[PDB]
Paper text:
IDE can effectively degrade insulin, amylin, and glucagon, pancreatic hormones that control blood glucose levels, as well as amyloid β (Aβ), a peptide implicated in Alzheimer’s disease. IDE is a 110 kDa zinc metalloprotease that readily dimerizes in solution (Kd =~ 10 nM). IDE has at least two major conformational states in its catalytic cycle; open-state IDE captures substrates and releases products while closed-state IDE performs catalysis. Within the IDE dimer, each IDE subunit consists of ~55 kDa N- and C-terminal domains, IDE-N and IDE-C.
In a previous crystal structure of the Fab1-bound closed apo-IDE, one subunit within the IDE dimer did not have the electron density for the IDE door subdomain. This leads to the hypothesis that IDE has a catalytic zinc-containing door subdomain that is partially unfolded and/or undergoes a rigid body motion. We thus solved crystal structures for Fab1-bound IDE structures in the presence of Aβ and insulin at 3.5 Å and 3.9 Å resolution, respectively (R/Rfree = 23/27%, R/free = 24/29%) and Fab1E- and insulin-bound IDE at 3.3 Å resolution (R/Rfree = 20/25%). Instead of being absent, as in the apo-IDE crystal structure, we found that the door subdomain of IDE is clearly visible in these structures. In fact, these IDE structures are nearly identical to closed-state IDE determined in the previously reported insulin- or Aβ-bound IDE (RMSD = 0.46 and 0.56 Å, respectively). Consistent with that notion that this is induced by substrate, unfolded Aβ or insulin is clearly visible inside the IDE catalytic chamber. The presence of insulin thus profoundly reduces the thermal B factors of IDE door subdomain. Together, our data support the stabilization of the partial unfolding and/or motion of IDE catalytic domain by substrate binding. In our cryoEM and crystal structures of insulin-bound IDE, extra electron density was clearly visible inside the IDE catalytic chamber, and the insulin structure is quite different to that reported previously. The extra density fit well with regions of an unfolded insulin A or B chain with a known scissile bond properly residing at the IDE catalytic site.
Author numbering:
A (entry chain a): 1 to 20
B (entry chain J): 4 to 25, 29 to 67, 69 to 128, 131 to 150, 154 to 155, 157 to 193, 195 to 212
C (entry chain A): 44 to 170, 174 to 245, 247 to 933, 935 to 944, 946 to 960, 982 to 1011
D (entry chain I): 1 to 74, 77 to 142, 151 to 203, 209 to 230
Write the structure that this text describes.
């Protein structure tokens, strides 16, 4: 309904050790 | 577009309402002191400007109304309603002058002969210090068609008028007479007559 | 203080926020915000730069991204590469950073008693080894390679490349091995010198730091002053771009894009000036609120009623300091793909309706009050993300309004809204259609991502039809939201309140857990419900019919529930292998009403055949699109299928989906609701009698309209996990047909889930976490995605490594084993003080209290689904954790090369090391499960 | 602190030209709109012109289309008057909008306030001769004052004892004489227990002080 916080691909956290 | 009324008179602490009638469905309100620059009172028809006393209220009924419930003696000014319009247009009204109504006062009558350096090139000046209302009659003596009159605006604290009368005469015609101010006012049982001689 | 230029007066915060704030600006230009919280267990800090990747040199694309990658590998005062992450890992902390076109934000958290110890090095980051560069180039290249086959990335960089090529907006922000290493080596460029000369833009006048900790505002003040006053100021002007990247020759254009997944999407873009400076009104949030609306009379209601669109998004998208965009993106059915012109025509009819009606001060006021309530009762955020967000937004707003700028609207100005509506016109539009039907009809290829697309000029005839758009009677302004909460009364805490959830009802119909909120005291509530029914996962047919039933239910209730979802009262409804799952979260004021409506639609569901066909085709497209997922995700999925006793593959679901028919589903819904169990967890600002009233309401509605009957206890069948044999190694092998990268997941299984084994596995995983990251990614540079940690499922646990790399999985596996021996030697040579340091780090990790209500209710629900009901788990398991000694060696010799009880299973997804035995390749999962035993189930509490 | 200053008003022969300057301070004219509003002698307010520097928009009144030209330099405003008649004699003020980035091209009018104003510059259009003031004292619970009889044009500023007397000062409005000049007097009431009046004429540059003594 409205563009939300970082809905594009720009958010590039250096490492992904916080997901799952 | 139009404003109502042209002028208004009320007492201190009295409720005053000004009806400005005008596109745009809103209005602005400004208060211009005599001589000084206008001051913003109300930008949006609902809210008021920051630092403006709460006694000012903007309303809309088509026709918009400025409301002053408690009227202070320092609110003597001319109120103007501003209307914005497409094509970047701004319009004002003819304004509304608010006259403060206090108790009847007594004019402190004074008289002033012309200065010595003025006869070197004369003007006698009668003066009324504080009085109400403005309706007064000043005459000079045998009368009178070259008399000038000037009134000040209502004071912010006393709300009392002051009257200045100027009688300009050449030196030759000034030396032709010796006895020289008949004032008639509301708070005067008998008309005071201040005079001077040579 | 002489090192402080100015100090803010007071930080405008919420009355419910107990944290203290103090903003100030140093003499060097750094915008500092300090947050004191004497009750937090972990402190955090973040530093934000305002340069980003749009300021990259034209010959080196991705230089700021590579610099962000590079600042973590050591500084002058601390030259070791992984001493930072090793310090944070040894002190129960973490770190990360991102880089947007106008930002480069670094952030980290750590234990509250070492904030200065970490913050010193974090400050050394802003005060370049050749080998570290040559190694990290491969990490950036594996990052971009990970982002190649991603549709959002492809359309993002394609949108960047379809604009003015001379504009920095067209630059490639990620970078790769070619632009960083190959091309500069071919052109004689010294990348290291480029890093040193770029680190002319890292000036203190463009930096914003935020520090949150237990220390007082004065101690934080002296600390930030001491550690940041020495940052040299170079007075770098903030980059602006007044010229819009989309010029006339780029407007009124149609782009036909071929995706990777079988998706059908439509993208409408309007170039608009930068509205950031208009944050006090947010006309993009206003117009986004009206256009993207989903209630009655909205655009999406018409697009759904016509069977063309299912979901719609519309609003303002950030561009830069000089340009922004306003986008409307929708999903397309098979009929909507052919009627794109009519969909856009309806869009311009809604826009023309908004231009005819004009701005709405009552809509603006409704948004203002709603945002004021949602901001006042906002949940307590996590320190890392909070400090990162505030640090990111400090450059846009003053110190006093940094906390309330993006949330609170104060002034209503319709001139701006009318101006943007004047900018939303067919002469300033850009249209992009994404569908597989364009396969083989494209003539252009994108340079960085290889995206196939076609560019055409929109016919002036179509533009004229858009310009003559009349008023549609199906488009009306939304009505007054009847879900706006007005009762914020916090119910007093009952005298029988329990710190942990209590079982206040246990009948054959349902089992109700309840707890009154005693920590947050906010007018909110979380209501979780699980419906057990054997017909939900009996076969792929019934599972597909269940997912279709829930999806049809949510799709039917979306228009009605959009107002409640906009009023801070959201809900999630998903299917699970044990039955349905329904969760209603948000303000408890009007929660039971909407919940009653949802149950009413559960027991009075009328299936639309058009919605059924469209949604069914969409689910088919989803099961088809699983083949384009990432290799590590495929590895986790395959390992899930292998370890679970009963699991249907997406190929079985896809094959059984064609046999689903409307009479079968209409006969299946009452068959599902005929026999049910219910397990609920009500945790929020409600009382015991209120919880019992809601539960009894649900039961009475289900019985009344659905004739629901309780389940037999013998039918409460939980699933077991496959038990691997001693010294047994099994390898399952598949291929990824989309990504050119390989994935691998190694899983070692343990005995069961008890306190001792849990603390063994968690302690070992705590010791090998940072060494795993540094060895497998920092030094050897296997890939960008390297993860290692514990895995728990069905009451059984183990250790898992998940790696996505270009190299083959057998080589990755051998390096994993060699790393295991290396960690054996490291633990054997490790000191007792470092061992106890890992003990303390894990204790702080596990004793971390939840910050918001949904996290606590999520922990309770996690203890409910496992049916262990161990609410005091943290205290008991940490109390046992502080009593462990360097047991871990015997555990490694018993469970983890020649261990007598080694249980190893590997998942290989195709694109000195010790000798490994011959693995048993898995041909068929069913035979694999039949040949091996199953583990027992965890006993209830 | 935000404030505006007008400068450029004076006496011009009918058919001449003039350039009024509205120097702004405390803000950026690039991010605000400037309005020009004059007031006729004894009449109400009347809007003259408007300009939005951001959008480059200008707005004139129906009374003056090809005679006035508004402009702005980035940090001063300029109002050009290329041909002034005998009816354009008025007191010119310049003000600003309270809100930022007001949109000129609109279908609905949104009347926002003009928060900050300036003292304004008076322009008079006549073929009369500019003259210096002529001060004459007046000799008297007491009351005494000074008189300015021959001066042109408006206005004059009268302050008692270098602006130290702020009580009982009554300065009367100017009145036109039959000769073609202005005249006004200023009185003050003081107790029976030295007093000098200061008169300043700026169009003609003249500053005259004069003491008042009884008898
Ligand atoms: Zn990165």
């Amino acid at each position: 309904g409205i563009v939300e916080q970082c809905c594009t691909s720009i958010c590039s956290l250096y490492q992904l050790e916080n997901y799952c | 577009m139009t404003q109502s009324p042209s002028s208004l008179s009320a007492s201190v602490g009295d409720r005053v309402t000004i009806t400005c009638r005008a596109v745009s469905s809103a209005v602005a309100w400004y208060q211009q002191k005599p001589g000084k620059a206008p001051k913003l009172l109300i930008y949006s028809t609902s809210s008021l400007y920051s630092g403006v006393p709460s006694r000012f209220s903007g309303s809309r009924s088509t026709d918009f109304t400025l409301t002053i419930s408690s009227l202070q003696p320092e609110d003597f000014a001319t109120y103007y309603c501003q209307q914005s319009s497409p094509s970047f247009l701004i319009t004002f009204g003819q304004g509304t002058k608010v006259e403060i109504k206090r108790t009847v006062a007594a004019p402190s009558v004074f008289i002033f002969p012309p200065s010595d350096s003025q006869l070197k090139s004369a003007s006698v000046v009668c003066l009324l210090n504080n009085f109400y209302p403005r309706e007064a009659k000043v005459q000079w003596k045998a009368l009178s068609g070259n008399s000038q009159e000037s009134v000040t605006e209502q004071d912010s604290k006393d709300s009392t008028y002051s009257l200045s009368s100027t009688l300009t005469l050449s030196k030759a015609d000034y030396e032709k007479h010796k006895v020289y101010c008949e004032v008639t006012h509301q708070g005067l049982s008998s008309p005071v007559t201040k005079s001077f001689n040579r | 203080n002489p090192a402080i230029k100015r100090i803010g007066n007071h930080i405008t915060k919420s009355p419910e926020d107990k944290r203290e704030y103090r903003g100030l600006e140093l003499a060097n230009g750094i915008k500092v915000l300090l947050i004191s919280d004497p009750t937090t267990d972990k402190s955090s800090a973040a530093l934000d730069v305002h340069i980003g990747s749009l300021s990259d040199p034209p010959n080196i694309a991705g230089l700021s991204h590579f610099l962000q990658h590079m600042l973590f590998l050591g500084t002058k005062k601390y030259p070791k590469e992984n001493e930072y992450s090793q310090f944070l890992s040894e002190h129960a902390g973490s770190s990360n950073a991102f880089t947007s076109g106008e930002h480069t934000n670094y952030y980290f958290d750590v234990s509250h008693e070492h904030l200065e110890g970490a913050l010193d090095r974090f400050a050394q980051f802003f005060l370049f080894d050749e080998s570290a560069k040559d190694r990290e180039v491969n990490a950036v290249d594996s990052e971009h390679e990970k982002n190649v086959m991603n549709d959002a990335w492809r359309l993002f960089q394609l949108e960047k490349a379809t604009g003015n090529p001379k504009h920095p907006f067209s630059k490639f922000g990620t970078g790769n091995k070619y632009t960083l290493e190959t091309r500069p080596n071919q052109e004689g460029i010294d990348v290291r010198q480029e890093l040193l000369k770029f680190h002319a833009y890292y000036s203190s006048n463009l930096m914003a730091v935020v520090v949150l900790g237990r220390e007082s505002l004065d101690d934080l003040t002296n600390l930030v002053v001491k550690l940041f006053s020495e940052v040299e100021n170079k007075n770098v002007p903030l980059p602006e771009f007044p010229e819009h990247p989309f010029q006339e020759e780029h407007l009124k254009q149609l782009y036909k894009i071929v995706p990777i997944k079988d998706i059908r999407n439509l993208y409408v873009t309007f170039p608009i000036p930068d509205l950031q400076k208009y944050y006090k009104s947010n006309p993009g949030h206003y117009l986004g609120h009206l256009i993207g609306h989903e209630g009655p009379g909205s655009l999406l209601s018409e697009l759904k009623s016509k069977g063309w669109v299912n979901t719609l998004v519309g609003g303002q998208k950030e561009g830069a300091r000089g340009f922004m965009f306003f986008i409307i993106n929708v999903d397309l059915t098979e009929e909507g793909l052919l009627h794109v012109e009519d969909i856009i025509l309806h869009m311009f009819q809604y826009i023309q309706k908004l231009r005819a009606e004009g701005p709405q001060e009552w809509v603006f006021q409704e948004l203002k009050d709603l945002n004021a309530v949602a901001f006042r009762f906002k949940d307590k955020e996590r320190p890392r993300g909070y400090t990162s967000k505030i640090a990111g937004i400090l450059h846009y707003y003053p110190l006093e309004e940094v906390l309330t700028a993006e949330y609170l609207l104060e002034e209503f100005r319709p001139d701006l809204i009318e101006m943007v509506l004047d900018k939303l016109r067919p002469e300033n539009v850009r249209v992009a259609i994404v569908s597989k039907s364009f396969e083989g009809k494209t003539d252009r290829t994108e340079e960085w991502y290889g995206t196939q697309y076609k560019q055409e000029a929109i016919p002036d005839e179509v533009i004229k039809k858009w310009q003559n758009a009349d008023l549609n009677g199906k488009f009306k302004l939304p009505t007054k939201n009847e879900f706006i909460p007005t009762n914020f009364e916090i119910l007093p805490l009952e005298k029988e309140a329990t710190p942990y959830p209590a079982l206040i009802k246990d009948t054959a119909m349902s089992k109700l857990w309840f707890k009154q909120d005693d920590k947050f005291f906010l007018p909110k509530a979380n209501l979780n419900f699980e419906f057990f029914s054997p017909f939900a996962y009996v076969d792929p047919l019934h599972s597909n019919m269940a997912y279709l039933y829930l999806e049809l239910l949510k799709d039917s209730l979306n228009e009605y529930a959009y107002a409640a979802e906009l009023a801070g009262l959201s809900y999630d409804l998903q299917n699970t292998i044990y039955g349905m799952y329904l969760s209603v979260k948000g303000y408890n004021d009007k929660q039971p009403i909407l919940l009653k409506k949802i149950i009413e639609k559960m027991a009075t569901f009328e299936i639309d055949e058009k919605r059924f066909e469209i949604i069914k085709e969409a689910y088919m497209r989803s099961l088809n699109n699983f083949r384009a997922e990432q290799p590590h995700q495929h590895a986790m999925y395959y390992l899930r299928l292998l370890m679970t006793e009963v699991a249907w593959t997406k190929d079985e679901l896809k094959e059984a989906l064609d046999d689903v028919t409307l009479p079968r589903l209409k006969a299946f819904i009452p068959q599902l609701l005929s026999r049910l169990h219910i397990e609920a967890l009500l945790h929020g600002n409600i009382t015991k009698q209120a919880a019992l009233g809601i539960m009894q309401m649900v039961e009475d509605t289900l019985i009344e309209h659905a004739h629901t009957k309780p389940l037999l206890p013998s039918q409460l069948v939980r699933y077991r996990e496959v038990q691997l044999p001693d010294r047994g190694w099994f390898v399952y092998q598949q291929r990824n047909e989309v990504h050119n990268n390989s994935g691998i997941e190694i899983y070692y299984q343990t005995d069961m889930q008890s306190t001792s084994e849990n603390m063994f596995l968690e302690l070992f995983a705590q010791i090998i976490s940072e060494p795993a990251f540094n060895t497998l990614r920092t030094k050897e540079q296997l890939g960008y995605i390297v993860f290692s940690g514990p895995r728990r499922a069905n009451g059984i646990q183990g250790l898992r490594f998940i790696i996505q790399s270009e190299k083959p999985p057998h080589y990755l596996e051998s390096r994993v084993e060699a790393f295991l021996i290396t960690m054996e030697k490291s633990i054997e040579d490790m000191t007792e003080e470092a061992f106890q340091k890992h003990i303390q780090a894990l204790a702080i990790r596990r004793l971390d209290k939840p910050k918001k209500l949904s996290a606590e209710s999520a922990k309770y629900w996690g203890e409910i689904i496992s049916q262990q009901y161990n609410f005091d788990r943290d205290n008991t398991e940490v109390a046992y954790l502080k009593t462990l000694t360097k047991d871990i060696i015997k555990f490694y010799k018993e469970m983890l090369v020649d261990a007598p009880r080694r249980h190893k299973v590997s998942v290989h997804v195709l694109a000195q090391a010790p000798a490994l035995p011959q693995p048993e390749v898995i041909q068929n999962m069913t035979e694999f499960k039949r040949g091996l035993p199953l583990f027992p189930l965890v006993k209830p509490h | 602190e935000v404030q505006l200053v007008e400068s450029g008003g004076g006496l011009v022969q009918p058919g001449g030209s003039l350039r009024l300057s509205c120097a702004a301070s405390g803000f950026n004219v690039s991010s605000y709109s400037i309005h020009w509003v004059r007031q006729a002698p004894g009449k109400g307010l009347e809007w003259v012109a408007s300009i939005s520097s951001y959008y480059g928009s200008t707005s004139y009144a129906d009374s003056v289309k090809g005679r006035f030209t508004i402009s702005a330099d980035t940090n001063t405003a300029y109002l050009q008057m290329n041909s002034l008649r005998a009816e354009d004699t008025a007191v010119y003020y310049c003000a600003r909008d309270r809100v930022m980035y007001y949109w000129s091209f609109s279908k609905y009018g949104y009347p926002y306030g003009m928060d900050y104003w300036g003292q304004g510059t008076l322009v008079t259009v006549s073929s009369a001769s500019t003259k210096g003031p002529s001060v004459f004292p007046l000799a008297p619970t007491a009351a005494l004052g000074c008189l300015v009889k021959d001066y042109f044009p408006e206005p004059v500023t009268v302050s008692w004892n270098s602006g130290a007397l702020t009580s009982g000062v009554h300065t009367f409005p100017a009145v036109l004489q039959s000769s073609g000049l202005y005249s006004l007097s200023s009185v003050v009431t003081v107790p029976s227990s030295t007093y000098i009046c200061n008169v300043n004429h700026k169009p003609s540059n003249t500053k005259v002080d004069k003491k008042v003594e009884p008898k």
